């Protein structure tokens, strides 16, 4: 099976780059993020051609990169979607985990 990469991984398709640490989300099963495509968990980079390669942040299609990281109501929880459930009614955790600025994702 594939191995989780080191922490400090750069997501930098955009001008608002974010650091991703596998270790802090080890409680999540790999395939919740590296989700099935054509019946097989896919471990390619999220913005691989044909995947989430549409860099218009308004796009809501299966190619929308921003959509895949930020939106609710998605087939697999997005970064923000899952973090919202974790934070619950805790406003401090909401700021840390879902805030658009001054959060753990965006400074
Ligand atoms: C679980 C044990 C698990 C594995 C295994 C795994 C692997 C993995 C690889 C091999 C990469 C590198 C991809 C590349 O070719 O560059 C990678 C990258 C990302 N991962 Fe992961 N990963 C596992 C678990 C999880 C979990 C639980 C999530 C989500 C909560 C997650 C997310 C990500 C993200 C985001 C990346 C960056 C990919 C990008 O295109 O920027 N992983 N992982
Ligand atoms: C990379 C770690 C990665 C993330 C993050 C990610 C997220 C994601 C979400 C949140 C959805 C649901 C969107 C919705 O509106 O329901 C979603 C859906 C699809 N994705 Fe994805 N995805 C990541 C990686 C990849 C890779 C490597 C590809 C391409 C090989 C890919 C493709 C797709 C497709 C197609 C869907 C829809 C699947 C379905 O509806 O069954 N994703 N992704
Ligand atoms: C999606 C690509 C995604 C990002 C980006 C992301 C980031 C992130 C950060 C920055 C933290 C804080 C800890 C750290 O610095 O590493 C953090 C923490 C938690 N996450 Fe996350 N995360 C992304 C995705 C997801 C998904 C899809 C889930 C759940 C299905 C998830 C969960 C969690 C949990 C739980 C934590 C810890 C909460 C805390 O209070 O520390 N993440 N993530
Ligand atoms: C808060 C709701 C919030 C906003 C708004 C926001 C915006 C935003 C922008 C403008 C981008 C760049 C899009 C582009 O293509 O120009 C971007 C990128 C990423 N984001 Fe974000 N963001 C908000 C919140 C959060 C939170 C809380 C996380 C993490 C849990 C997060 C994550 C990401 C990720 C991942 C990216 C892509 C990074 C890259 O590849 O460069 N955002 N965001």
Description:
The chain has 107 residues and is α+β, with helices and mostly antiparallel strands. The protein has a single domain (1-107), classed as Cytochrome C3. The protein contains 4 helices and 4 strands, in the order ββαββααα. β1 and β2 (18-20) form a beta hairpin. It starts with 8 loop residues before the first strand and ends in a 9-residue tail after the last helix. The structure holds protoporphyrin IX containing FE (HEM) (4 copies). Residues 11-18, 55, 57, 66, 69-70, 79-80, 83, 98-100, 103, 105-106 line the site of one protoporphyrin IX containing FE. One protoporphyrin IX containing FE (HEM) binds next to α2 and α3.
Task: Name a few traits of the molecule.
monomer; 107 residues; alpha+beta; Cytochrome C3; two-stranded antiparallel sheet; 4 helices; 25% helix; globular; binds protoporphyrin IX containing FE; electron transport; monomeric; Cytochrome c3
């Amino acid at each position: 099976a594939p191995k989780a990469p080191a922490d400090g991984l750069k997501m930098d398709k955009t001008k608002q780059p974010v650091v991703f640490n596998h270790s802090t989300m080890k409680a999540v099963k790999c395939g919740d993020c590296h989700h099935p495509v054509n019946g097989k968990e896919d471990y390619q980079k999220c913005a691989t051609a044909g995947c989430h390669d549409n860099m218009d942040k308004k796009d809501k299609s299966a190619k929308g990169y921003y959509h895949a990281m930020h939106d609710k109501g998605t087939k697999f929880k997005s970064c923000v979607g899952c973090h919202l459930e974790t934070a619950g009614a805790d406003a401090a955790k909401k700021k840390e985990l879902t805030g658009c600025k001054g959060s753990k994702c965006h400074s």
